[PDB]
Write a protein that binds this ligand. Structure first.
Ligand code: JEB
Ligand code: JEB
Lengths: 212, 200
């Protein structure tokens, strides 16, 4: 049973997640994903969520007072607050496994230059906070990262949704001049396992030498 | 100017998407898309036949064929810069255990093909990776190291937490140095590999 709350100024971006969820898992009370428009917690008629950065620089910073009110309402002491950020700790499969047994994830999606740091720092005094990055590239905001995190985590929750994997093949045995490796059709399953292991070793050397 | 075509059995997942156009295609338009793996194993493999017909129609020899896969080369900001000046990206999104390897191999005989991974975690398919790649690339299209440090805005005091006084000082050199120190401190703590140190 996991609850995920996502807070964002672009609620529509999280539409795929809602679609990804099988009815059986929702009906069994195994998972609930709710998406919240950050502007519900704005203070002014202009529904302001950002303001100029102290110390100067380009871009804007999301307002602490708005985020503070949102997280005050949504989070409890048991919440794991997830904050995507290009400056975060790396989100890995190990992370996904750890988070898959949490009762309550709240994902705070920023835009612009990010969220005033006091939001996370204040929250960390009353709950667990994790600033994470999904990879070494730059996005426009946290929403695509939330999609990735939600999928990676929920597929590890029962019935909700190292070396590199080698190539896979299926029918037909010959296609556009290319035959499936004959070893795979040999019925020698110890040999097939060794062939697959060597394919994986070769691919890891070529594509991810860092893993070795 | 860039054209992006995305091919998927779940076109609805791509909904979050003048100098750039993005089109989404249902792979099933070219047909059962999957079958059991040769050599055994759990799960299913996407058939090369359907993919071949799809890519035949959508791709040219100019196309950069992008194939998300957990076994890919890393997609990084460098990749995003490289791809930002391409005329035509086609992103082939797999499901199940992935796509028959011959699809990429066949395609590489007539176009440039890039198998890439957006990170060291496992997804159920290529679609979320496609969304990440598109976002990272499009923001670099003409006409559109170290970890960044913390940012602050008004009010200068909030819940008894102050904005670092240097940021209020108006001293550009001191502000630049404090920010450099914050960034290097964050990088050592969170991504020591970026500075050539062992990971945790
Ligand atoms: N996780 C993760 C990320 C993000 C990401 C996450 C949240 C935000 C909120 C704003 N931006 C834009 C921005 C651009 C430049 C500097 N600072 C901020 C975000 C980028 N980018 N790349 C990742 N792997
Ligand atoms: N880029 C990227 C990815 C993917 C990814 C991309 C395409 C597909 C097509 C199917 N699956 C599920 C699957 C699961 C396990 C083994 N093999 C395949 C995909 C996962 N996962 N993690 C990433 N960083």
């Amino acid at each position: 049973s996991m609850k995920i709350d996502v807070v964002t100024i672009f609620p529509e971006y999280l539409q795929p997640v809602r679609q990804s969820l099988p009815g059986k898992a929702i009906d069994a009370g195994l998972v609930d994903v709710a998406v919240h428009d950050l502007r519900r917690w704005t203070h002014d008629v202009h529904k302001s969520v950002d303001d100029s950065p102290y110390g100067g620089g380009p871009g804007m910073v999301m307002k602490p007072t708005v985020w503070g009110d949102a997280l005050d309402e949504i989070c409890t002491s048991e919440t794991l607050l997830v904050v995507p950020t290009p400056a975060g700790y790396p989100f890995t499969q190990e992370t996904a496994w750890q988070w898959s047994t949490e009762d309550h994830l709240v994902i705070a999606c920023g835009r612009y230059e990010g969220i005033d740091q006091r939001v996370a720092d204040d929250a960390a005094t009353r709950m667990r906070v994790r600033e994470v990055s999904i990879g070494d590239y730059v996005l426009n905001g946290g929403e695509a990262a939330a999609l990735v995190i939600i999928e990676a985590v929920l597929r590890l929750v029962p019935g909700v949704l190292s070396l590199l994997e080698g190539p896979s093949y299926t029918r037909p045995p010959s296609w556009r001049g290319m035959d499936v490796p004959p070893v795979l059709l040999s019925g020698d399953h110890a040999k097939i396992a060794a062939w697959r292991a060597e394919q994986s070793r070769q691919r890891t050397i070529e594509r991810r030498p860092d893993l070795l």
